Amino acid sequence: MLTPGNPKWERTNLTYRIRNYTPQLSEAEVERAIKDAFELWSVASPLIFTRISQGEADINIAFYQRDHGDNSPFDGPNGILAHAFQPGQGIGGDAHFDAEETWTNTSANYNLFLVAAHEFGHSLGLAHSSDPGALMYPNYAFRETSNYSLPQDDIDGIQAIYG
Ligand SMILES: O=C(O)[C@H]1Cc2ccccc2CN1S(=O)(=O)c1ccc(-c2ccccc2)cc1
Ligand SMILES: [Ca+2]
Ligand SMILES: [Ca+2]
Ligand SMILES: [Zn+2]
Ligand SMILES: [Zn+2]
Prior knowledge:
alpha/beta; Collagenase (Catalytic Domain); five-stranded mixed sheet; binds ligand BSI; binds calcium ion; binds zinc ion; Neutrophil collagenase
């Protein structure tokens, strides 16, 4: 469950910024998905996330298509959904979402809140889990989102890094 080399944030109050949006959800819907994805991790750790509207943030969030500057191009509809970088300066921590997906707040593929929640595990230093019940499992699946809380394996993982 931890990324190789154990990269972790040295501070526990991190900022984030949503750089752009996906047209398929309202702006408020995207903001809510992201807010709630961060809160999943915050309630199981000492981490506090502060949104900023402009300027430089620890965790940049953006929707991109195909080639987007980081040498890991997205691939169009389906396939890779999103990716994120391990804790560190600059691109470290940042989370990118494939702009060519269908992004939802429903049970229809792909629920943005769930994908974001998984990606922020990477942004915080977690690796993939082998535990098919974990949020950090390597394959997407819908789960009910209305009252969602971190699966136990992911609590264990974030606790192992940050207490
Ligand atoms: O893992 C990633 O971040 C990226 C990049 C990567 C790198 C190395 C190995 C596999 C993958 C798979 N992809 S992905 O886009 O296909 C993906 C995204 C989210 C979820 C997920 C799981 C559970 C709940 C909700 C979402 C699963 C897979
Ligand atoms: Ca960053
Ligand atoms: Ca894709
Ligand atoms: Zn990228
Ligand atoms: Zn992943």
